Amino acid sequence: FVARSIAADHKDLIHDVSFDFHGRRMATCSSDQSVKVWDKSESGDWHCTASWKTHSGSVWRVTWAHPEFGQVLASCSFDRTAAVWEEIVSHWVKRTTLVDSRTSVTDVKFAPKHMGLMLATCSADGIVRIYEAPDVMNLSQWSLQHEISCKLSCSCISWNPSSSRAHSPMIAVGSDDSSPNAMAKVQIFEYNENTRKYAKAETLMTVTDPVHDIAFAPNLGRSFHILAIATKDVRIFTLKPVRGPTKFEIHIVAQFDNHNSQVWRVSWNITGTVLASSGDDGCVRLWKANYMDNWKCTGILK
Amino acid sequence: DIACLLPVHKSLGELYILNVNDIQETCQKNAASALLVGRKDLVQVWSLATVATDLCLGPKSDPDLETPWARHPFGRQLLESLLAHYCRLRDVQTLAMLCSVFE
Amino acid sequence: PEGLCYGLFGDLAFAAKESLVLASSALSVFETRWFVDTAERYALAGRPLAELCDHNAKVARELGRNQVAQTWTML
Numbered sequence: 001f002v003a004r005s006i007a008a009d010h011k012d013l014i015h016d017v018s019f020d021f022h023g024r025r026m027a028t029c030s031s032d033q034s035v036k037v038w039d040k041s042e043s044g045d046w047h048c049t050a051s052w053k054t055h056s057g058s059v060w061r062v063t064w065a066h067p068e069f070g071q072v073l074a075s076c077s078f079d080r081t082a083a084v085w086e087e088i089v090s091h092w093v094k095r096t097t098l099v100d101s102r103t104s105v106t107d108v109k110f111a112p113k114h115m116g117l118m119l120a121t122c123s124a125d126g127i128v129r130i131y132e133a134p135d136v137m138n139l140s141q142w143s144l145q146h147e148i149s150c151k152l153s154c155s156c157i158s159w160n161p162s163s164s165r166a167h168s169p170m171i172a173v174g175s176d177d178s179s180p181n182a183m184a185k186v187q188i189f190e191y192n193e194n195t196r197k198y199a200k201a202e203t204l205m206t207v208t209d210p211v212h213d214i215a216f217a218p219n220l221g222r223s224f225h226i227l228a229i230a231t232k233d234v235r236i237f238t239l240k241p242v243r244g245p246t247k248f249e250i251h252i253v254a255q256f257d258n259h260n261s262q263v264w265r266v267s268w269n270i271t272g273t274v275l276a277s278s279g280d281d282g283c284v285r286l287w288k289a290n291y292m293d294n295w296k297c298t299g300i301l302k
Numbered sequence: 303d304i305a306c307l308l309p310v311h312k313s314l315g316e317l318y319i320l321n322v323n324d325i326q327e328t329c330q331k332n333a334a335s336a337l338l339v340g341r342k343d344l345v346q347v348w349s350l351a352t353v354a355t356d357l358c359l360g361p362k363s364d365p366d367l368e369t370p371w372a373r374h375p376f377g378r379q380l381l382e383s384l385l386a387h388y389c390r391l392r393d394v395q396t397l398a399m400l401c402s403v404f405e
Numbered sequence: 406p407e408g409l410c411y412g413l414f415g416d417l418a419f420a421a422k423e424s425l426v427l428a429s430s431a432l433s434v435f436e437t438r439w440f441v442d443t444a445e446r447y448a449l450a451g452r453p454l455a456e457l458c459d460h461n462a463k464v465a466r467e468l469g470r471n472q473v474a475q476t477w478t479m480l
Binding site: 001002003006015016028046268274278280281 | 411421432434
């Protein structure tokens, strides 16, 4: 309900904000080619601890890693690169640089902890790459494992945070091309143990307007999957596995136009029960579902 | 005088009570009365009835505020599994009481 | 022009362009519990079944959860 305010002192637009595993740190990246780290004191105010130049072009996304491996951050830029940083004993040092790309890199994400130390990046030329670190205590050695061609532009990716032994690894990719022809903009890939290669599982032919963000939901014991999509509206989908690629029954359980503009970002909570959306009007909206599976709004924040 | 071969007992019909203004008391009194005849089943059933009909589980008015106790698997589904059990035994005397307390 | 994050034992972090609320942005953290208290007040071993069930039923009732309380008692 209440709203704090902190002076970022950035010289351009902030493009991403990310929290950490334990909820006490915070990172912010901008188009002035810098990354800042914030901490929380007992008094409740936030202070900037570090600030250092990272790339030579605009920085789009920054993300954390699990504390089992260390204090690690990853960034992507307009320089066609991606980097890994670590905090050592109290400044941050660069461990690697991933330069296999050929166009701008638009997203970076860390894999769930039970797969190891894995990374996934997406590029504007339609290629999604997955890296891996075999030995944890040497963060300067990564290894390219897979490569996916999407036959369209790419703008966002997401992993399946499920930790079950009956769900194979997943990744979903969204496009942002605005060509007059109507093609699908969301595609889902799945990993098959026998052939050891990612294969296409399903496509969302119902989505045609450009996509701006995509996010799964925390599982925490469910038997099916939930997906959230940011477009001209807000759409929420269900994928229920059936008893080669696994077949799914795809449905739609929400389509909300209360922003009356483009929807830019989406985010879930820890338990996977509430969804937050941000739109062109400058307001944040929260959605929740009752026991009859009807999604209704729960708050408006400005 | 063959009354030991039917599912209804005459003494229980003389000891049972119904009182709309206080459901809690009726369940305990009937549970006590079931022990005077020696039926293991009825004691457990009337024990469960007490906790399933407490006044702290009242339904609310807005659907988007809580999940009702009826949808809970210890609500309608347990009642519908006791009722189906006693139907096969032809025990009218327990069915009529159960269908009345939960009303 | 936007950035969102939902990090929990607490609330949101919003960063939006200043011509929407140009070449500047405004960053604000919002301020929008029963899990911690019930995790260190329970009891899982060291007593017979009957003693374990009534103990847990007392915690849930005090915290304000009645449906969970009656599940322990029926068990």
